[PDB]
Design a protein around this nucleic acid. Structure first.
Ligand SMILES: [Mg+2]
Ligand SMILES: [Mg+2]
Ligand SMILES: [Mg+2]
Ligand SMILES: [Mg+2]
Ligand SMILES: [Mg+2]
Ligand SMILES: [Mg+2]
Ligand SMILES: [Zn+2]
Lengths: 150, 204, 97, 129, 86, 48, 214
RNA sequence: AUUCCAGCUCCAAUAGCGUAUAUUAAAGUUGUUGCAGUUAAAAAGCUCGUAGUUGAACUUUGGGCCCGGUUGGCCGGUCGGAU
RNA sequence: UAACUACUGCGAAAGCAUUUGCCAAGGACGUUUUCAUUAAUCAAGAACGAAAGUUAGGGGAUCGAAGAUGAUCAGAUACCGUCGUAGUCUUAACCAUAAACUAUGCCGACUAGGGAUCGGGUGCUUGCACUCGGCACCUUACGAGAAAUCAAAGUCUUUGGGUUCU
């Protein structure tokens, strides 16, 4: 199940069968792109966007109504993050726990959990370097982590 | 045919006897014979199916060439009279009360039957007959409830075997239909002289 | 050969359970393993209630009860006949009486 | 993780035929599963089956007819010279008269008799009897 | 099993379970051969004239002999609304 | 699986694993260490 | 004289059922041994092993004798009887009874070509008893029975000419070996080959046809 | 003393037969085919992790044609070969 | 850190139980959010690892190796009885082991009934059902096993899902 745990939980989204859809939604393809791009300038992530368009607007999945996935919409408009969203949030997490350990040396569990998080960072970064979205000498350094993310 | 189906007059006898009532929270998965669960925990046995199974069972009994080679077991108190009446009418040889292990196996025993068909009132309590049947190529009928075990029973009549009337009534009807088949009663829907209340247990 | 699925205790689901000391002999025993019994009885004993009631100023009021959670070790409980040897089949039964 | 989708399909089929069922849900589907099942159908070891489009990998519902003793993969998919089908059939099959070792060849997925006739060989895939 | 010159060289040809097609062996003593009587018009039921099924020990053992009859009977018209595919 | 690698390209592990496990056999260990020559009164000759 | 006390035995004495194939067709439970002695006359017997067994008392060593007997016609019928008794030749006699009652059919077949009267087994078949497992593998003509002496004899009495065998487990536990070989040859008719796929109509039992006589 | 030293008699292989050491089969007791690991020997105290091994599904499928081939044909007709 | 306290929970394991804050962490569940093969298992190499034990500061109630000491006994520097050093607690360092045990590697799929219960969710007629995920448990044995027994120890001579270790 989980990468770094015994947990075998199956919780996820079930995307519907309908690709070309839906019949109750009226807003056009060009209209929603504006709403995406509007939220991108305001300083949100592709995941945060797609939540707002599910809730406040009626957008089921942007890939259906628009055609392209939200990251491509931002990639075209030139609101691409320097390093991918998921990697960012892992680094953010590392920096948190690293900063915590400086004050708490006897927190043996935090030391353990820091190993797991940094392992996931290194695995992701390996992935990105292969498919060439990070440059081929990109490196997660614990020193220059807080500088990068924030 | 169309005549051998549920006459309304028979459906009164089923619903009077409370043979439509079934087992409560317990409910074996080998039972789709069930209309619905009531407001209370009880399940309602689908008496249409109960009838169809009964006739099917009757035809199997009817097929047996020598009537004595049928045997009709009950260890249960409430079924003890019913099997003795069925034996008298239908020509079967019954076993009331103690079954006697080594009945069907073991040719040396005094109570050594060699049947071609068995009927049983409760398969849970008459489990030794059902178990022994499987050692010697003998088919089985059973007046099962919805909580009853289903192992080595070939045709099962779904019905209440909690109640006193239910058991005797299903036994009565079975005896009737095996008589209507064969030249005995020659019915065209004739309610029959013998009452259902004959088959029920006495209570001293 | 293994004798009990439970390993003669009740742990399955956790690593360590803190111990308790046997009431008779003070043998340390993991709580889950300890043969526990509650012992409830009146402070005054039976037969003395006759003589206590008469000397009792006020009515009986409420003759209170002692409440004392005994924890035994296996050897002490078997010695005392708090619990006894059973047959292989009868071992499996987990019912009170 | 899930490694051989074919292995899982044939395992499911074996388990159902042992329990006397007359139908099996398989999941995922694949080209190779389907190709395999068609070889089983052609020799009458199964009945109809029905791919269920789910806009993902798919599900199959096979119908069983009691005739199947054992399907099974071989893993890994060994390379087989034309010479050495005779050894695989000797090892895997109950007799010389019946049952089929199944090969991926460049000619196509097929039983070992077809491969004798067509004079082709390739990789062993599984077996049926 | 014929030989070259035709001729069944089989010692005998087994029966097969009506529920599962499994061979019923010589020693399978929990196997069973039910005969339902073919009713004529009037509903008298004839000497001979059976609707023979046969069930392996295996199926009976599992508690699937009931549901297997209902199916096999309803497909030969002996029941009408008992068994269901859904 | 069966606790040994089954992969098509797993020949190295299989060969090496088997080499390491052959030291557990009696005759093999004696034959390769050269016990007969080194110890053993006769020096691996039938007679003396 | 016999005097039968079982329906099947009634039909055998009458001579209504002629051959044992009608028994095996319908899976008729055979309880009297004279049923088989009549139907299958030229049925040789042999004793494989006699083994002392011993229960411990306050007396000491109370010894019975466990005989292992194998019957067969050398033409596709074989049986296996195990009995233990106070006396040896008592155990043998009661063994031959159980051996007779056990008798089963053996599906013989051809290794390759469908030439002229089957010589080997149809298929590969195994049996397991205890630790022991015996696999029986069809062999070409002129192979003989490639088995250990005890298993060989059970296969000779079954009427196999040519077969390969591989065992595994404590084969020195002879009772378990023979029982596993006996499960193997038993299973020859278990296995559904494609030539037995043709749907037959289910024949009626002699315990319905000749019902009056029983 | 059914087992030693002998006599008699008998068995086995036989111009050969025995012994020693090594080796192969027996050995699914080295296990790719093909072993075992709760309790017989054996699951690492636990997790992370590089090489190694392994890794979901998806991209021309089906249909209609046409032309030579190779065996059995169908009349192998003379019990062997021919179209 | 009693009683509460369980065939209950959490944690990778070792382990973890008075209250309330602060600090990060985590599973499961919910999801018409996002990326799109990034994964599984892993020689080498690493983190953590009960108790005892070690070094140096603090602390030193209780229990208590050693030791003292009274009985017992042929002896009894053993059990029993009375004291008592290190130890038992803590800080900074070490140590790297236990019947560290479910004596059961991990990941994946399938095979069978049942009721309990813990967490989340949904429906309601509001205490019951369904559902996913957990700790377990009862019956049977289809199967498996040398057996004891086992829903995994099954789907292995009808012998091949992936992989580490022994
Ligand atoms: Mg999963
Ligand atoms: Mg991992
Ligand atoms: Mg522990
Ligand atoms: Mg071994
Ligand atoms: Mg290491
Ligand atoms: Mg150790
Ligand atoms: Zn104690």
């Amino acid at each position: 199940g989980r990468m770094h745990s015994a947990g075998k939980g199956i919780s996820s989204s079930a995307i519907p069968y309908s690709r070309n859809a839906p019949a109750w939604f009226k807003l056009s393809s060009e209209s929603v792109i504006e709403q995406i791009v509007k939220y991108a300038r305001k300083g949100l992530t592709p995941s945060q966007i797609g939540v707002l368009l599910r809730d406040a607007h009626g957008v089921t999945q942007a890939r259906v109504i628009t055609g392209n996935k939200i990251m491509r919409i931002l990639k075209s408009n030139g609101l691409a993050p320097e390093i991918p969203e998921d990697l960012y949030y892992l680094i953010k997490k590392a920096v948190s726990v690293r900063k915590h350990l400086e004050r708490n040396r006897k927190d043996k569990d935090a030391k353990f959990r820091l190993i797991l998080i940094e392992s996931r960072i290194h695995r992701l970064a390996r992935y990105y370097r292969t498919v060439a979205v990070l440059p081929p000498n990109w490196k997660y350094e614990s020193a220059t982590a807080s500088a990068l993310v924030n | 045919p169309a005549t051998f189906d549920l006459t309304p007059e028979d459906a009164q006898l089923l619903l009077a006897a409370n043979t439509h009532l079934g087992a409560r929270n317990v409910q074996v998965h080998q039972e789709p014979y069930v209309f619905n669960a009531r407001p209370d925990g009880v399940h309602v046995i689908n008496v249409g199916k109960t009838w169809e199974k009964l006739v099917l069972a009757a035809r199997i009994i009817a097929a047996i060439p020598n009537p004595e080679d049928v045997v009709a077991i009950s260890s249960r108190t409430f079924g003890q009279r019913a099997v003795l009446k069925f034996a008298a009418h239908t020509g079967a040889t019954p076993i009331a009360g103690r079954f006697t292990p080594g009945s069907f196996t073991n040719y040396i025993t005094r109570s050594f039957k060699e049947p071609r068909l068995v009927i049983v009132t409760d398969p849970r309590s008459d489990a030794q007959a059902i178990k022994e049947a499987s050692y010697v190529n003998i088919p089985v009928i059973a007046l099962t409830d919805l909580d009853s075990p289903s192992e080595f029973v070939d045709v099962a009549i779904p019905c209440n075997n909690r109640g006193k009337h239910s058991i005797g009534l299903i036994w009565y009807l079975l005896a009737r239909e095996v008589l209507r088949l064969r030249g005995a009663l020659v019915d065209r829907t004739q309610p029959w002289s013998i009452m259902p209340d004959l088959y029920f247990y006495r209570d001293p | 050969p293994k004798k009990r699925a439970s390993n003669g205790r009740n742990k399955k689901g956790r690593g360590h359970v803190k111990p308790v000391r046997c009431v008779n002999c003070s043998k340390s025993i993991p709580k889950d393993k300890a043969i526990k019994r509650m012992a409830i009885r009146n402070i005054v004993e039976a037969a003395a209630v006759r003589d206590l009631s008469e000397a009792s100023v006020y009515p009986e009021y409420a003759l209170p009860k002692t409440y004392n959670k005994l924890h035994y070790c296996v050897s002490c409980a078997i010695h005392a006949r708090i619990v006894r040897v059973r047959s292989r089949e009868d071992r499996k039964n987990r019912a009170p009486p | 993780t899930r490694s051989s989708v074919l292995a899982d399909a044939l395992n499911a089929i074996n388990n159902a035929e042992k329990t006397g069922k007359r139908q099996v849900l398989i999941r995922p589907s694949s080209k190779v599963i389907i190709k395999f099942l068609q070889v089983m159908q052609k020799h009458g070891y199964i009945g109809e089956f029905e791919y269920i489009d789910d806009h993902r990998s798919g599900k199959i519902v096979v119908q069983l007819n009691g005739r199947l003793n054992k399907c099974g993969v071989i893993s890994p998919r060994f390379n087989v010279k034309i010479g050495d089908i005779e050894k695989w059939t000797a090892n895997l099959l109950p007799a010389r008269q019946f049952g089929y070792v199944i090969l991926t060849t460049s000619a196509g997925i097929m039983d070992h008799e077809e491969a004798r006739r067509k004079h082709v060989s390739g990789k062993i895939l599984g077996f049926v009897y | 099993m014929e030989n070259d010159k035709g001729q069944l060289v089989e010692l005998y040809v087994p029966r097969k379970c009506s529920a599962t097609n499994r061979i019923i062996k010589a020693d399978d003593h929990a196997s069973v051969q039910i005969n339902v009587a073919k009713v004529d018009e009037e509903g008298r039921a004839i000497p001979g004239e059976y609707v023979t099924y046969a069930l392996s020990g295996y199926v009976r053992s599992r508690g699937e002999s009931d549901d297997s009859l209902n199916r096999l009977a309803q497909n030969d018209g002996l029941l009408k609304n008992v068994w269901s595919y859904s | 699986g069966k606790g040994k690698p089954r992969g098509l390209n797993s020949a190295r592990k299989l060969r090496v694993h088997r080499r390491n496990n052959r030291w557990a056999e009696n005759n093999y260990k004696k034959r390769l260490l050269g016990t007969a020559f080194k110890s053993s009164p006769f020096g691996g000759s039938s007679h003396a | 004289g016999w005097v039968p006390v079982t329906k099947l035995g009634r039909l055998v004495k009458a001579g209504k059922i002629t051959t044992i194939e009608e028994i095996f067709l319908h899976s008729l439970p055979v309880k009297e041994f004279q049923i088989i002695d009549t139907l299958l006359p030229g049925l040789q017997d042999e004793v494989m092993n006699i083994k002392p067994v011993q229960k411990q008392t306050r007396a000491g060593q109370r010894t019975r004798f466990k005989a292992v007997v194998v019957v067969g016609d050398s033409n596709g019928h074989v049986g296996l009887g195990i009995k233990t008794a106070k006396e040896v030749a008592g155990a043998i006699r009661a063994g031959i009874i159980i051996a007779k009652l056990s008798v089963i059919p053996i599906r013989r077949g051809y290794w390759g070509t469908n030439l002229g009267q089957p010589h080997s087994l149809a298929t590969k078949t195994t049996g397991k008893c205890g630790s022991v497992t015996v696999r029986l593998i069809p062999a070409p003509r002129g192979s003989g029975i490639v088995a250990s002496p005890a298993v060989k004899k059970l296969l000779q009495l079954a009427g196999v000419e040519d077969v390969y065998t591989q065992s595994n487990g404590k084969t020195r536990t002879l009772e378990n070996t023979l029982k596993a070989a006996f499960v193997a040859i038993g299973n020859t008719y278990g296995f559904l080959t494609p030539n037995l796929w043709a749907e037959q109509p289910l024949p009626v039992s002699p315990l319905d046809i000749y019902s009056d006589e029983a």
